[PDB]
Amino acid sequence: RPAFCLEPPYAGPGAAAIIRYFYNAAAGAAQAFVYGGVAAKRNNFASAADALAACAA
């Protein structure tokens, strides 16, 4: 499991309200979060499937 998969979700400073997904390793689940549209970190994916593929192979 790449180490980035343990990062808390990061909305960043932006004012957009975009739905993205992060891997929540404690929950063993990909979960939706709000992304502000700038300053993404790595635990940020377009879909739950993409998050699971990277982080729960």
Residue numbers in the entry: 1 to 57
Pull text from the paper.
However, the alanine substitutions exerted a small unexpected enthalpy stabilization, and the magnitude of which increased in a nearly additive fashion along with the number of alanine substitutions, which was, however, over-compensated with entropy destabilization. A structural analysis indicated that new water molecules were recruited into the spaces created by the alanine substitutions, facilitating protein–water hydrogen-bonded interactions as well as interactions with the methyl group and creating hydration networks around the substitution sites.
We mutated the exposed and partially exposed residues (P8, K15, R17, R39, K41, R42, and D50) to alanines because we expected that these substitutions would minimally affect the densely packed interior of the native protein45. The mutants were named according to the numbers of alanines in their sequences (i.e. BPTI-19A stands for a BPTI variant containing 19 Alanines) and a suffix ‘a’ or ‘b’ was added to distinguish variants containing the same numbers of alanines at different sites45. On the other hand, despite repeated trials, BPTI variants containing 25–27 alanines merely formed needle crystals, unsuitable for diffraction. All six variants crystallized under the same conditions, indicating a minimal disturbance of the surface properties, even upon multiple alanine substitutions. The R39A substitution also recruited 1–2 new water molecules close to the amide nitrogen of Ala39, extending the hydration networks observed in BPTI-21A. The new water molecules were recruited around the alanine substitution sites and were involved in novel hydration networks. Thus, favorable protein–water interactions appear to be the most likely factor responsible for the increased unfolding enthalpy of the simplified BPTIs, rather than the relaxation of atomic clashes or the creation of new intramolecular hydrogen bonds or van der Waals contacts, assuming that the hydration structures remain the same for all alanine mutants in their denatured states.
